[PDB]
């Protein structure tokens, strides 16, 4: 199944934040309307914030998170959770190796803002 792709409400602001937990340098690309709208890069084995930004979901509302280490896509896991029918989290984990902790880059998207 496709992972890391979320349909947000169209033309809506959302937050995206990435954390790193790996010896490899993480590159996180956030795509809106299939074009790269933000790129975060960093290295941490202690959950450091490697990027945070507010973006607009575009005309289609399609948001895609891609994670790579030295150009190779990591394996993604993802889900969306909704609390009290209003507060949205789109969650991504990624695995860049073989230990399958899936925390190597962790990406949190949340909306609405404001």
């Amino acid at each position: 199944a496709t992972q890391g792709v979320f349909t947000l409400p169209a033309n809506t602001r959302f937050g995206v934040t990435a954390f790193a937990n790996s010896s490899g340098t993480q590159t996180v690309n956030v795509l809106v309307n299939n074009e790269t709208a933000a790129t975060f890069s960093g290295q941490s084995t202690n959950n450091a914030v490697i990027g945070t930004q507010v973006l607009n979901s575009g005309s289609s509302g399609k948001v895609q998170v891609q994670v790579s280490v030295n150009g190779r896509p990591s394996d993604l896991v993802s889900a969306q959770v909704i609390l009290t029918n209003e507060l949205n989290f789109a969650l991504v984990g990624s695995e860049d190796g073989t230990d399958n902790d899936y925390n190597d880059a962790v990406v949190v998207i949340n909306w609405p803002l404001g």
């Binding site: 790996s22 010896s23 490899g24 280490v69 030295n70 190779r72 860049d96 190796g97 073989t98 190597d104």
Partner: peptide, 11 residues
């Protein structure tokens, strides 16, 4: 990261 021997011979 990667598919590896010895924590990284292979990548």
């Amino acid at each position: 990261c990667x598919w590896x021997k010895x924590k990284x011979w292979x990548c």
